[PDB]
Amino acid sequence: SYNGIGLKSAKGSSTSGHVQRSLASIETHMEKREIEVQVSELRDRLEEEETLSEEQIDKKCEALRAKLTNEWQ
Amino acid sequence: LPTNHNKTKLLKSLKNTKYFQQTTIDWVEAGLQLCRQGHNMLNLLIHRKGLTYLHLDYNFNLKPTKTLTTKERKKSRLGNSFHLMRELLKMMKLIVDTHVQFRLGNVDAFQLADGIHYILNHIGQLTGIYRYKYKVMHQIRACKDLKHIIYYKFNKNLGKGPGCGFWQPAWRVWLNFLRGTIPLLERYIGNLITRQFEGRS
Amino acid sequence: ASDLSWSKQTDTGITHFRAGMTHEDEKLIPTIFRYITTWENEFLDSQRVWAEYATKRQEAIQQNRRLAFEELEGSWDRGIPRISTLFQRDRHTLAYDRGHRIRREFKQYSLERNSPFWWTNSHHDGKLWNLNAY
Amino acid sequence: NEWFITGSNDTTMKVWDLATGKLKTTLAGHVMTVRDVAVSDRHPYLFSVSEDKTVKCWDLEKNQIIRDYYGHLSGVRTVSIHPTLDLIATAGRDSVIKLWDMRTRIPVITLVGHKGPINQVQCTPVDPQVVSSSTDATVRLWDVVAGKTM
Amino acid sequence: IESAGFETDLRLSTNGLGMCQLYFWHKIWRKVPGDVLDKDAFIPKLKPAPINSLSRDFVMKTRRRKGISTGGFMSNDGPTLEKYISAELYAQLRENG
Amino acid sequence: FNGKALNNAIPGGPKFEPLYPREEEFNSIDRVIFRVPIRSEYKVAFPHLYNSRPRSVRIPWYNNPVSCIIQNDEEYDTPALFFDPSLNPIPHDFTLPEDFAPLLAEEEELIL
RNA sequence: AAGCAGCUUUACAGAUCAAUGGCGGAGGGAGGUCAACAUCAAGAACUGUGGGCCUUUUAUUGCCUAUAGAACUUAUAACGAACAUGGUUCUUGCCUUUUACCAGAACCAUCCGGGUGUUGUCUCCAUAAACAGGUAAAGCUGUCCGUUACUGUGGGCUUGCCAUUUUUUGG
């Protein structure tokens, strides 16, 4: 049985077994995200340039956050 | 798998007696003598049983001389063994007689090869072995199938017609048949000949 | 022929054809199923020709003429039961034949060789097929 | 002692289980009533006298018939595997014990002298090597070499 | 999923001269054409599914293998409504947008 | 041998009886992605992959390397070593004695 | 790879014409549609010799090691690059019962053949091969016989070559 179509055997059916193929077939959220980004940037800046102490960076970051808040109502 | 301790063969067990003798003859003489001796042996098998009205012709056609009784149809039927001998000797006599029709000067070597390839691909027509042993049909189908290959590789630019005589693989198929039914005929004819001499158990 | 791993699962389209009884000749032997009208195509036609007969009978009562069967020709061998039953020679005798279906169906319990047409009766239904064109 | 086989009149020997009482296989090579079954001691065989006139050998590494001992003149009733040689002792209705070489399937030594059908044959490793008994009320002790009732 | 024996196809088309080696070390992953959530995608049964309805096919049958679906009908995809959108306002806003 | 053991035809190959009479949730069309119709040449090529339940199946010989044999079929005109027309083109002090010869420098003929 | 030194060889010129010692010899080569005996389906799988270790008395099993050999087929596993047939049992077909069958399986066999080793015989061609002991077999051994064991010509190569830190031309 080629392609699983034909017989088990030509013997038994008493046919020829000649199987042939058929020719018939949100805004608030966004704002928040922005704020976060800004904060991150600030942090990065601090890291880059003179901010081994935490208080400074934290302070600056806080200020930035406050500013952002003010801006968004 | 073949047997490994088969030191005995047939002809090697017959050289070692005082009765068989070695010689060198032509193949055509060996074939004509096996035709003569096969005719004598089948004629004596017939004539020991008393079947003197079955005129076994020289081409190994068993024909009743007269129309029979039923008693002369019961003793004059024979099994697959005797008839299988008769049909293989028909086959061999066709082979040897085509080689004789060559050797006499009548027919060409090309026409010999086509005649042989006609024999070895019409055993089911020229002879009649298909009757008494039906697995011969396997080999007959194979011979027909070899015909169907060889006539469309011999005749690419030749079309249709006789003349093809590449008889080698059909010859191999009938030799493999004989390889199979040497011991079959040994047992069958051994039982028949011991019924003729020794008798029924 | 179709995929016998798939054919026991879904309604496969007829994607292949196995050859039924090949002969060496190319004899296109006609088959009996093409010369027998299928049942839906008998029953829609039966509703049509019996609507035509009931309309012609209502008109022939309105015309007060007896409906001779030279008019129904052409529709003489159509419909189940056949129109040719209506003008057979024993219609007054077969007027009183009731229960003939099961009488012909229970012949198999009292006959050794029942006819294989246990279901039809040409006295009450007529010949439902015609194979003289086959 | 993993199993015991019971030949029966429905021609089908069945191999039952001692510890559980289960079937495991069914050996149905005969066509007549299986009369005697004798499982070998030093061979993985199973000799099954039926009244098919056939003594069949069942190769228990295969559960197949391998050998069929023909030569009995009527129905056979009993087997007796000689426990320290390669021969089996089959006897039956034909009043004569046929010894059988298990290789060549030849009736080696016929044992002549019982009158009626022989019912039960037993083999010993030392002479009397065939202790048989028949319906003529005789328990004959056999000499396997001489073929005579000792 | 489309190369179920591309190698033997190149060998049997070219009568033995071709040779194919399929590999996945540059681990590339391409979008199947057609949407997942396309419930109005036609699915054939014996011929392969069309291209624009492939992914709807490639979801569904795998779901029927893993038991997350509930039968051989065209529903039981992965919707937003089954996971969290259970109140009617979220469902009607998602279908109304 | 795989075509015989799997009831399975090859176009040039012979047909046999099935060695096993095989009849009848898991492998239903509900759970089958139909992309590649499994031709029987797959089931004879890779017999353990494309066949649910094979047995008595001999492991088929997976391919030889790509035989690039040049046929030299020009009328006894080409030498034994030459650049065949089907071959792709290729797009790319210290002193010693004068009598320092290569190996096999005694003979001139590269081919015979 | 020219040569020289060295080693070996045969044709030798040579010392004894001894007692030595190597090599070779102590009844040939090619074969043959010659046969006889082994042997050829497997822990990938084989034997020789020797030691040692286990039974309740060291016997037939079975291992660990040491070395010398494994011819013949074997991996897309098999003596055969080819391929028949028969038996039993099961399952199909043809069916009208059996033989004869369809055609698959399983387990077995039977035939045409084949390889290798040894022994022997046969054919063709040749020709100190002397004496003594045995086995299943041979210069196996003892006595023994040619070139000859101490130089040179002629061939072959298993080698080396054609002072300035680590070897051979000075602590």
Ligand SMILES: O=P(O)(O)O[C@H]1[C@H](OP(=O)(O)O)[C@@H](OP(=O)(O)O)[C@H](OP(=O)(O)O)[C@@H](OP(=O)(O)O)[C@H]1OP(=O)(O)O
């Ligand atoms: O009858 P066709 O279908 O045309 O075939 C015939 C037929 O072959 P088949 O045995 O297969 O039928 C002949 O065989 P026979 O009639 O002799 O039995 C054979 O002739 P030969 O055997 O004598 O050779 C002949 O072959 P061609 O005529 O080419 O020699 C061949 O014809 P196709 O070649 O067309 O098949």
